[PDB]
Amino acid sequence: DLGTENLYFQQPRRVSFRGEASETLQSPGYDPSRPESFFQQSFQRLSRLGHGSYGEVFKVRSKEDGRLYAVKRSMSPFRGPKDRARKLAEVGSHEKVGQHPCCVRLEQAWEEGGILYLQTELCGPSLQQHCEAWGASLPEAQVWGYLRDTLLALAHLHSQGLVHLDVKPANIFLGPRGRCKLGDFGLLVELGTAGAGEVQEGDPRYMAPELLQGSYGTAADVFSLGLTILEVACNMELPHGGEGWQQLRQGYLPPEFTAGLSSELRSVLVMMLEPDPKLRATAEALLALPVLR
Numbered sequence: 001d002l003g004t005e006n007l008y009f010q011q012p013r014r015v016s017f018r019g020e021a022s023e024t025l026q027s028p029g030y031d032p033s034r035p036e037s038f039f040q041q042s043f044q045r046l047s048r049l050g051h052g053s054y055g056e057v058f059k060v061r062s063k064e065d066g067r068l069y070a071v072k073r074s075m076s077p078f079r080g081p082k083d084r085a086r087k088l089a090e091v092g093s094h095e096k097v098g099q100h101p102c103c104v105r106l107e108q109a110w111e112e113g114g115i116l117y118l119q120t121e122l123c124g125p126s127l128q129q130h131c132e133a134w135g136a137s138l139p140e141a142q143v144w145g146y147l148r149d150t151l152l153a154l155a156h157l158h159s160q161g162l163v164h165l166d167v168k169p170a171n172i173f174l175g176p177r178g179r180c181k182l183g184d185f186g187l188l189v190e191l192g193t194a195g196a197g198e199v200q201e202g203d204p205r206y207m208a209p210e211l212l213q214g215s216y217g218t219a220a221d222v223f224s225l226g227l228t229i230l231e232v233a234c235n236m237e238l239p240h241g242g243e244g245w246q247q248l249r250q251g252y253l254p255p256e257f258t259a260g261l262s263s264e265l266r267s268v269l270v271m272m273l274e275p276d277p278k279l280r281a282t283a284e285a286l287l288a289l290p291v292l293r
């Protein structure tokens, strides 16, 4: 596709599949004739929230409004048109999701020097970070709300034919008094549009079993959330592979870690962890249960 096109082998510009009034960037503190990047000139860099092969996430203060944000910056200039398209897809997916109280809000995005910058609202800690700070299983009173909020997010995605494909503790973010937002939309696919195939794999700890056979559907996210909540509620490390990975995808809940679950929460997780995606409860069906209203 892009690989056989004459797009190979070739000044900040706004990135947006919903063109706003001009794609030239401006800000207090920014002069395009100075050599520093828009990101360097237009933000106070406060701390690094994360890093990896993808690049880095920074906590920043905007010079435009003085508010705090999270900016993700890719590691190196685009390898080529397919690499560029893959990274820009995160912006498109954020815009497909749009405004929802339980989804992370995208403020703006731009490219400069082959680097993609994604500016979102700054959220509270991820569930992974919150569990690390707690040092123990999270109380079920909290967990029920995290489950409900993230199911509301998934119901929103799934109603638009979108599959997140990488739901995990590290991209569900706390908020005000115990509300959660789902973020990290880099692997999200629009069913029927991706024609893929070329779909990347999420974290193997939370991967739905049917994805091994290439059966992609909204049900995959319900399974991933099931194991996300299992991990959070039981302080249980999940296997990347091996026999334990298989057991969790055969309807098995290890007694060593899960005996402390209430029957109510266990029963909901059993619905979400159904190995057969055709029998697995939907986000909307789970939200209709009295326990989750």
Ligand SMILES: CN1CCN(CCOc2cc(OC3CCOCC3)c3c(Nc4c(Cl)ccc5c4OCO5)ncnc3c2)CC1
Pocket: 049, 050, 051, 057, 070, 071, 072, 118, 119, 120, 121, 122, 123, 124, 125, 126, 170, 171, 173, 183, 184, 185
């Ligand atoms: C010292 N701690 C004080 C509390 N503070 C809480 C807020 O932490 C975050 C962390 C984020 O990302 C890390 C979480 C786990 O994955 C690695 C990074 C946030 C985040 N990440 C993010 C992701 Cl995962 C994907 C795309 C993005 C992102 O920002 C902009 O575009 N986004 C928003 N808020 C975050 C708050 C931690 C430090």
